[PDB]
Design a protein around this nucleic acid. Structure first.
Ligand SMILES: CN[C@@H]1[C@@H](O)[C@@H](O[C@@H]2[C@@H](O)[C@H](O[C@H]3O[C@H]([C@@H](C)O)[C@@H](O)[C@H](O)[C@H]3N)[C@@H](N)C[C@H]2N)OC[C@]1(C)O
Ligand SMILES: CN[C@@H]1[C@@H](O)[C@@H](O[C@@H]2[C@@H](O)[C@H](O[C@H]3O[C@H]([C@@H](C)O)[C@@H](O)[C@H](O)[C@H]3N)[C@@H](N)C[C@H]2N)OC[C@]1(C)O
Lengths: 260, 203, 141
RNA sequence: AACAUGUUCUU
RNA sequence: CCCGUCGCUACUACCGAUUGAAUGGCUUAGUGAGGCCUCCGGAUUGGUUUAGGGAACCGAGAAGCUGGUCAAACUUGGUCAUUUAGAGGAAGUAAAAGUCGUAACAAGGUUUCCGUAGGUGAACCUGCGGAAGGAUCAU
RNA sequence: CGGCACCUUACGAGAAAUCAAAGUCUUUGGGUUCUGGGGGGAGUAUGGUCGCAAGGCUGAAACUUAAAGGAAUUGACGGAAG
RNA sequence: CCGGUCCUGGACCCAGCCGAGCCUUUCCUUCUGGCCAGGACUUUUACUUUGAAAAAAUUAGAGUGUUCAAAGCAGGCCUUUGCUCGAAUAUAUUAGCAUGGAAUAAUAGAAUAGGACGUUAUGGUUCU
RNA sequence: UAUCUGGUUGAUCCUGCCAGUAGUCAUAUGCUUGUCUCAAAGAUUAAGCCAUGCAUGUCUAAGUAUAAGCAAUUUAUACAGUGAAACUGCGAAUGGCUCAUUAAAUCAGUUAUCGUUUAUUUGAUAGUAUACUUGGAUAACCGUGGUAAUUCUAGAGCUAAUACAUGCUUAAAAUCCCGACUGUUUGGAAGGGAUGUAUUUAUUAGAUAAAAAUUUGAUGAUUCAUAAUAACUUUUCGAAUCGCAUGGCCUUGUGCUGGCGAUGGUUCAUUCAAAUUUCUGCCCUAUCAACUUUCGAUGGUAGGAUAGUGGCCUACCAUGGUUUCAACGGGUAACGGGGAAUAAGGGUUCGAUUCCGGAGAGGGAGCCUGAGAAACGGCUACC
RNA sequence: GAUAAGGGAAGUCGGCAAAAUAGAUCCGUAACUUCGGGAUAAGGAUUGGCUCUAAGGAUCGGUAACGAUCAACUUAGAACUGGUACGGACAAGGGGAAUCUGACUGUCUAAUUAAAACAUAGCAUUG
């Protein structure tokens, strides 16, 4: 087709953006950036369709042209910036902070956080190898590259990064017993804890997990995001629900119970 | 133009395929360089992605390696004496990869004499004996004499390689691709491969 | 079977036999393990054949799909065609029909294959117009 | 032994 | 009740001299625009930069020239497919009350029918073998 | 034990005539081959193929049409019988 | 049945279903560290179970006085300088991937023995 | 709602079709037509032909301003504000339209790249063994014009850069090769070179089965990454750019210095893409049974070409490859799919068309530019 | 016995006469058919010189798959080259669509007729 597409049709936009059908023909097309097109949430969606801070995209343009909006602390003006998993969005003018986290229903809930909290994030180790001049580095899930990591770090490990200096604070080894959070699949948004991992050479590795309530659920290894060291201790704040799935009758019961 | 697509060919069953689309630029070919031996002329080619290739149309000199000795020098190419794929390239001295060529043996001779102190050729004529007597009676300081002694023992080389040093031209194989890189580089023939090509040549 | 039976010299790439190094005055031979649990044959390691398309003594890697089938021709130099039988389900009649496909695969001279035998073939890079597979294991016919 | 034929259309 | 030829009319399709015609595809051979590569060329131009008047020798270089390569397109021939004219010929079907006979339905007045072969205005007749779907389930 | 048949019955089958299979089939599945899809046009035309020929095998379409057909019932008729 | 009744609650008997483990001549890989985690081997298939994943829109379907409805994915709250549940769920699976089972239907095996075991059998020849 | 009814006969029971009946996001047509919400709309025949107008442009404080353009006198006799033109940069390869071609092709699910290119984005990332900052061109502009005519341009005179070409500003210790003298059983030494990163070739690291008589990454897997040696290159680039604030130190010189930024740059990573690619799955047709292989058909070796694999092409060689499990050929009133209509169940029929994939821009072919096009609101040629 | 601008059978009873074709290699070849043919159907391409390359043998001598020596003209390919020539003289088919007629090869009017006439195999009749 002669070259790269620059438009995204509304019906072809990822469903986890909850874009209404009849608004118009097109959808925001997330720019090339740190996260994949499909597994990211562009800033215009975050700052318009979630927070209702803007009535439309022109006012989104105006808001970001005034250095208000920040991603991972740095200032961004790209209206279609592909904000993704673990990203921290700072709004100093409103005195408000956020972190993109998968709510259990499968989306990015509006997760408010504190200023002290809005200064770090987490990163899965894609690979570890030597660059030029023999210097070792590890690649994270957000396109960040860090040189001179701990000589023990391997793939599938989570690291803590400070959003100011880009430095690594502390990390996690991947093994049985780790609190995690599924990154894709049908088990999206739910928080579990590693039970077992089954290794298929040449294939796709399988990992067995368990929620706080006893539920064993398997998932592709590539969708496992370690979020802690043990059960009950995440390294970030969790949304209203703590990542446990509730059946439709359960939620209906709870809605009736709450409303009287 | 020239194309590399597979759609113009018959299926493995033997069916004649129908036209699918017009020719695409991402499947082009180009003209062979047909590199020759002469004064250097190198033309750049703009390729896909903004990269560059170099069509060696004519080359004088190439960087050749004596593999065993761990040394390589920028000699000059005399001619083409054998090509595995077509005798038309040897008959017209066309340089491509894997062409058997003769190079100037002179710079390797200088390196041999300077790094060791012995000489090659081994022929016992007039000029050969005169140069041998000159080399054996050269002026060497005591520390250079001792470092050359530390380089002794392994001084002698295989009988086929040094025998050819009588003519000042060795046998080599082109290892570079002159049409792709603009370099005409290679390595000296040695051992089993050398015996194979000599058997092919003298015949 | 003569190893140097061409108009060119047959050798493995960048495997140099320094004819005066120390003591191993033999034609050095390289190989690899193809992975996935498959055994490197002994005729590949202590052998003399030269095959740029050998999974073990050549530069092709195995990756993708692993297939098995019955050999129906060895009438080609160093490649075979295997026959994979299968059943195709036709939902309207709730029944099956017997269907087959022919696959061409490279067979290293490390193996001794003949018509009637079951092979396992691993996928490699396209190494011919029709060949994308490569014999890895041979069983009795 | 002989013996061919029966305008059209209904109620 | 009913069969075929024959007579008037209408419609459909078939065969048919015309080496008929037209349209569309594929293709041998012949010619071949143009680009690209290559090869020299050298209008022009700045000096690798240096010379008492400037004489060398550096660089850049247009038109054009050589040989290739891809190859539109035209002519010729071939082939394939699809429409289509045609003297005349031979069918089919339809259409209240035209002609000739009466083949079948009753043992339909020579039981009927099948295959084959001859004959004849027409239905049909005759020979050889077969069937009962017979006019005999039987002496 | 095998065979050519026959008689009675009708549980059963069938539109019936009838059927020991034409039964064990809406309570619908033992294996398997071939053939048909209203009546004509037509086993015609065309192409192919076999044949010495006569012909055999393969085999359409346009068009036309409301029935054609099967088995039985009552009557009528018979150059049928009593 | 205790009955223990606030629809529902515990040890005991009764039976019923889905399961496990041992023992019966006994299948159910095998070593190392020392009920997991790194080595050495595996007769092939069909079939069936379960799962990973599988674009929205459309379909089926939960919530919503678009005044109804088709629809849409919204909206509702003492009336705020705010607070708020949401944007469900199944369907997809011929082919590929992973997985439990061993009925049904195949395939292989020891017959000129060229057969199986000898763990720490015995001897010999090679390699690392 | 898992349903039938009329028609052969004097009457009957059947076969069997014709007819009736209901739906269609299925099209046309007739008649008729008050209100509201929603809404398809030159696909079908002609991917036939098209008058006219519009559909792609683009400037921030941060590339280049003597408009002989506009405003006023101002922290500005180098300019400083606004703002034409032009140079430079970027975009124009997206979108939108259509369904002609196309039947293992496209496409769908599923794979692969240990088989490649990738502007941009986002991470990183280079002190390498005249410098108070080098040159010369041209546009814009005034000026003479030529053609019937076009988004045609020629002579002449200026003049710029983030345009074009050139070129230094520089650490620290250390390693290696050559080595005149010199110590003297094998030392020191003057003096020469290479130090980065790109390029090409060759050769070495890149190890990890458990006890006697040292450091080393990843993968299922590599000749992987990375590193070293010797050499190679019509030498890649390791910043001669720009805006606002103007600070601090005095050894007071238009001194040494240093804040947010613009833009740019090599390599790797990432992201957006692309190109190939595995397995299985397409309608009718035998009045299509053999097809392919001259001139590549199936395979092998070597090369050439490509971004890269590969008969992609060439040379030599072998004689192979597909097929009744339907090859090959022919038809399609055939773009594929998500889907649509009807629906007891099983099915039947439709899908040009709101999303995804492909293909095309009258027909054919060939190219330029560019990261990306065989582009047509780009060029070239033929019809 | 030759040649001829443009036209190309308009000449003539009639293409009479002349022209055109022609060797060899490679390609390609219809109807019809007694299946043998038709067929050189039709219709295309190539061909010189020079310099090379490859293939095809004989006799001796013990994985001899080798060496030594000898030897004939055929075939195929490539580079170069010229006023694009080249079966360079010579030699050497024009072709196609049909009708009448005799099957065919063969035979006769020496000295105006070569034919459709005679013969023929096949078929029948007669003694
Ligand atoms: C000379 N032989 C003839 C034979 O040719 C043929 O005759 C046909 C005859 O069948 C045709 O007759 C046809 O058409 C006629 C027409 C009145 O419609 C009708 O009789 C009927 O439809 C049909 N049979 C007629 N039209 C031509 C004859 N040669 O059949 C009869 C025959 C006597 O044997
Ligand atoms: C039964 N056989 C018949 C034969 O008898 C004959 O029948 C004709 C029939 O065709 C005539 O009838 C025909 O012609 C008339 C008119 C044009 O004359 C038409 O109106 C009528 O529809 C048509 N069928 C009829 N009038 C007399 C019969 N004998 O017609 C030929 C035939 C079919 O073979």
């Amino acid at each position: 087709a002669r070259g790269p597409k620059k438009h995204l049709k509304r019906l072809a936009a990822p469903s986890h953006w909850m874009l209404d059908k009849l608004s118009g023909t097109y959808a925001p097309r997330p720019s090339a950036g740190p996260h994949k097109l499909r597994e990211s949430l562009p800033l215009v969606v975050f700052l318009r369709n979630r927070l209702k801070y803007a009535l439309n995209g022109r006012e989104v343009k105006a808001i970001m042209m005034q250095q208000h909006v920040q991603v991972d602390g740095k200032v961004r003006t790209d209206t279609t910036y592909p904000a993704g998993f673990m990203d921290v969005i700072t709004l100093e003018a409103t005195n408000e902070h956020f972190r993109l986290v998968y709510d259990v229903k499968g989306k990015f809930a509006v997760h408010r956080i504190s200023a002290e909290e809005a200064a770090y994030k987490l990163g899965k180790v894609k690979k570890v190898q030597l660059g030029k001049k023999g210097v070792p580095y590890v690649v994270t899930h957000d396109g960040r590259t860090i040189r001179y990591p701990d000589p023990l770090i391997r793939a599938n490990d989570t690291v803590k990064i400070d959003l100011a200096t880009g430095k690594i604070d502390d990390f996690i080894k991947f093994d049985t017993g780790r609190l995690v959070m599924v990154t894709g699949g049908r088990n999206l948004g739910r928080v579990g804890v590693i039970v077992h991992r089954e290794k298929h050479e040449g294939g796709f590795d399988l990992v067995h997990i368990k929620d706080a309530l006893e539920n064993t659920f398997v998932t592709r290894l590539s969708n496992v995001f370690v979020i802690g060291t043990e059960a009950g201790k995440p390294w970030v704040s969790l949304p209203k629900g703590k990542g446990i799935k509730l059946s439709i009758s359960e939620e209906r019961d709870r809605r009736r119970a709450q409303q009287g | 133009g020239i194309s590399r697509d597979s759609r113009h060919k018959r299926s493995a069953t033997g069916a004649k395929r129908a036209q699918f689309r017009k020719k695409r630029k991402f499947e082009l070919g180009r003209q062979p360089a047909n590199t020759k031996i002469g004064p250097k002329r190198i033309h750049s080619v703009r390729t896909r992605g903004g990269n560059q290739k170099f069509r060696a149309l004519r080359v004088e000199t190439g960087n050749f390696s004596w593999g065993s000795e761990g040394v390589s020098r920028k000699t000059r190419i005399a001619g083409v004496v054998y090509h595995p794929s077509n005798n038309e390239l040897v008959r017209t001295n066309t340089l491509t990869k894997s062409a058997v060529v003769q190079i100037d043996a002179t710079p390797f001779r200088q390196w041999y004499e300077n790094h060791y102190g012995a000489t090659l050729g081994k022929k016992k004529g007039g000029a050969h004996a005169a140069h041998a007597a000159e080399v054996a009676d050269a002026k060497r300081s005591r520390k250079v004499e001792r470092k050359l002694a530390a380089r002794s023992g392994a001084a002698a080389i295989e009988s086929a390689v040094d025998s050819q040093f009588g003519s000042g031209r060795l046998y080599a194989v082109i290892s570079s691709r002159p049409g792709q890189s603009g370099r005409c580089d290679g390595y000296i023939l040695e051992g089993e491969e050398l015996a194979f090509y000599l058997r092919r040549l003298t015949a | 079977l003569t190893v140097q039976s061409e108009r060119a010299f047959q050798k493995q790439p960048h495997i140099f036999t320094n004819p005066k190094a120390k003591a191993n005055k033999k034609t050095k031979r390289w190989y690899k393990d193809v992975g996935l649990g498959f055994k490197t044959p002994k005729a590949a390691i202590e052998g003399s054949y030269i095959d740029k398309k050998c999974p073990f003594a050549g530069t092709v890697s195995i990756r993708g799909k692993i297939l098995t089938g019955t050999v129906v021709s060895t009438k080609m130099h160093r490649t075979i065609i295997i026959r994979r039988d299968y059943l195709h389900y036709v939902p309207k009649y709730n029944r099956y029909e017997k269907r087959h496909k022919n696959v061409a695969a490279h067979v290293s001279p490390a193996f001794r294959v003949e018509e009637g035998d079951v092979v396992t073939v691993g996928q490699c890079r396209p190494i011919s117009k029709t060949v994308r597979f490569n014999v890895l294991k041979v069983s009795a016919g």
